[PDB]
Swiss-Prot record:
This is Petrobactin-binding protein YclQ. The gene is yclQ. GO terms for cellular component: membrane raft; outer membrane-bounded periplasmic space; plasma membrane. It comes from Bacillus subtilis (strain 168). It holds the Pfam family Peripla_BP_2. The keyword Chaperone does not apply. Belongs to the bacterial solute-binding protein 8 family. Residues 23-284 form the Fe/B12 periplasmic-binding domain. It is a lipid-anchor.
């Protein structure tokens, strides 16, 4: 069977994978949605179905094996499927060795310090494996065009933005190079606070922090909503304390699709969606 050498984060010298694999187990939802965009649903053997973003609900179909959750893979079930390729990302990073004993495994997570570089590389890798290089090239081109358009819109406004995630009432902030840094790094929104320490969990902040930052646009992700726990966005954004924040009083709170933003991202479909949510937010009147 014809093989292709795939350089990835967890083996920069390259992992041999079969060309046109037929039984792929996918633990990265971005990668899953790239496969979907390329019309490759048929070769997905399994994915973790514990929680699925709405745009991926089709994958509840029993033709796809449930291999657990993003943080708790059902390794025996993965092995049972006799997969010919496994795709993982950051949440399974430490289990690379375990997955590799089952089948060739590649890591396709975005590097938020180098978002577009890693995004394009991941997509192109999928293109090469499944003989969809031209389709990927064209899709990346359209995405670049959409990104240029949102960036132009963001820069026209002369306004800034703060990105926060709510989690059972606790708030954390995300700036450049962070998990949700792309809103600034890629989409061009000026950061209301350049100095937020980049991380995956975000910088813990208070309501007083939102007030002192006074962002013109407020991008909100709700971790609770994403994972099926209680939402806590309204207690934050409709709190009396921040009623005078620009984003709040001017109606520029942008409620992102939390499930997609938290559980997914980094794929052709999720990126397309994410651009449009930001663009729509930035284009709203008032």
């Amino acid at each position: 069977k014809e093989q292709i050498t795939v350089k990835h984060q967890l083996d920069k010298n390259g992992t041999k994978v079969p060309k046109n694999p037929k039984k792929v187990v996918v633990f990265d939802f971005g990668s899953l949605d790239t496969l979907d965009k390329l019309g490759l649903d048929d070769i997905v053997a399994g994915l973790p179905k514990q929680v699925l973003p709405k745009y991926l609900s089709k994958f509840k179909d029993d033709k796809y094996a449930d291999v657990g959750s993003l943080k708790e893979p059902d390794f025996d079930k993965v092995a049972e499927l006799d997969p010919d390729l496994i795709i993982i990302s950051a949440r399974q990073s430490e289990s690379y060795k375990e997955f590799s004993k089952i089948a060739p495994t590649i890591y396709l997570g975005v590097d938020t310090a180098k978002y577009m570089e890693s995004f394009k590389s991941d997509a192109e890798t999928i293109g090469k494996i499944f003989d969809k290089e031209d389709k990927v090239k064209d899709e990346l081109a359209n995405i670049d065009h959409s990104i240029a358009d949102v960036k132009k819109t963001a820069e026209k406004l002369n306004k800034n933005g703060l990105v926060i995630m709510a989690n059972d009432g606790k708030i954390s902030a995300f700036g450049p190079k962070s998990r949700y840094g792309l809103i600034h790094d890629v989409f061009g929104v000026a950061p209301a606070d350049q100095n937020i320490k980049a991380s995956t969990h975000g910088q813990s902040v208070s309501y007083e922090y939102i007030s002192k930052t006074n962002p013109d646009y407020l991008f909100v992700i709700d971790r609770g909503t994403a994972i099926g726990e209680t939402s806590s966005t309204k207690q934050v954004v409709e709190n009396d304390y921040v009623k005078n924040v620009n984003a709040v009083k001017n109606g520029h709170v942008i409620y992102l699709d939390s499930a997609t933003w938290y559980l997914s991202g980094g794929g052709l479909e999720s990126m397309t969606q994410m651009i449009k949510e930001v663009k729509d937010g930035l284009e709203k009147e008032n």
